[PDB]
Amino acid sequence: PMDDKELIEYFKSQMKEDPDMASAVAAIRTLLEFLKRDKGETIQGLRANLTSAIETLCGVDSSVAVSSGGELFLRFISLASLEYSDYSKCKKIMIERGELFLRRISLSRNKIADLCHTFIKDGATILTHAYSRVVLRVLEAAVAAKKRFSVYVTESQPDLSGKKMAKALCHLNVPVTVVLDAAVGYIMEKADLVIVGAEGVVENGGIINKIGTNQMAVCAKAQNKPFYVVAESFKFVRLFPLNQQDVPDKFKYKAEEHPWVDYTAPSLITLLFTDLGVLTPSAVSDELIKLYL
Partner 1 sequence: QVPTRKDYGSKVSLFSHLPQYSRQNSLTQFMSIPSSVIHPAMVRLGLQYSQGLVSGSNARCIALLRALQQVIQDYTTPPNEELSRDLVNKLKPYMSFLTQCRPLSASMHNAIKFLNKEITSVGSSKREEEAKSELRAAIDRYVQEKIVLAAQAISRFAYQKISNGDVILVYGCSSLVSRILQEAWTEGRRFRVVVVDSRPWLEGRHTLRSLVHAGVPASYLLIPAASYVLPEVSKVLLGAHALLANGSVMSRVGTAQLALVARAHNVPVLVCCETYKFCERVQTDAFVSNELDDPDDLQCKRGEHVALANWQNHASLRLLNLVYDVTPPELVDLVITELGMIPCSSVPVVLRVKS
Partner 2 sequence: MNSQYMFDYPAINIDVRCHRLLSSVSYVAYNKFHTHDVSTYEHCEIPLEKLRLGFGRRNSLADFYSLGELPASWGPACYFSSVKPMMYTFQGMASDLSRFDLTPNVLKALSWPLGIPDCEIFSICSDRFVRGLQTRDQLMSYILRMGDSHSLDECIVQAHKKILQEARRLGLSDEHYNGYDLFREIGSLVCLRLINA
Binding interface with partner 1 (CB under 8 A): 203-205, 238, 240, 242-243, 266-267, 282, 285-286, 289-290, 292-293
Nearer to partner 2, 43 or 166 (CB): 43
**Considering CB distances under 5 to 8 angstroms, the limit depending on partner class, which of partner 2, partner 1, none binds residue 78?**
partner 2
Contacts (Cβ under 8 Å, ≥6 apart) of 132:
165, 196, 197, 230
**Whole-number Å distance between alpha carbons of 53 and 56:** 5
Report which of 196, 181, 198, 199 is spatially closest to residue 250, judged by C-alpha positions: 199
For residue 28, which phi and psi values (nearest 5 degrees)?
-65, -40
Q: Is 125 helix (H, G, I), strand (E, B) or coil?
A: strand
**Considering CB distances under 5 to 8 angstroms, the limit depending on partner class, which of partner 1, partner 2, none binds residue 204?**
partner 1
**Considering CB distances under 5 to 8 angstroms, the limit depending on partner class, which of partner 2, partner 1, none binds residue 182?**
none
Quick check: 152 and 179 in contact, CB under 8 A?
yes
Give Rg (Cα) of the chain.
20
Residue type, 223: Q
Q: Which residues bind partner 2 (CB under 8 A)?
A: 1-4, 41-45, 47-49, 51-53, 55-56, 71, 74-75, 78, 81-82, 238, 292
Nearer to partner 1, 164 or 238 (CB): 238
**Whole-number Å distance between alpha carbons of 198 and 214:** 12
Nearer to partner 1, 173 or 243 (CB): 243
**Considering CB distances under 5 to 8 angstroms, the limit depending on partner class, which of partner 1, partner 2, none binds residue 106?**
none
Nearer to partner 1, 240 or 253 (CB): 240
Nearer to partner 2, 79 or 145 (CB): 79
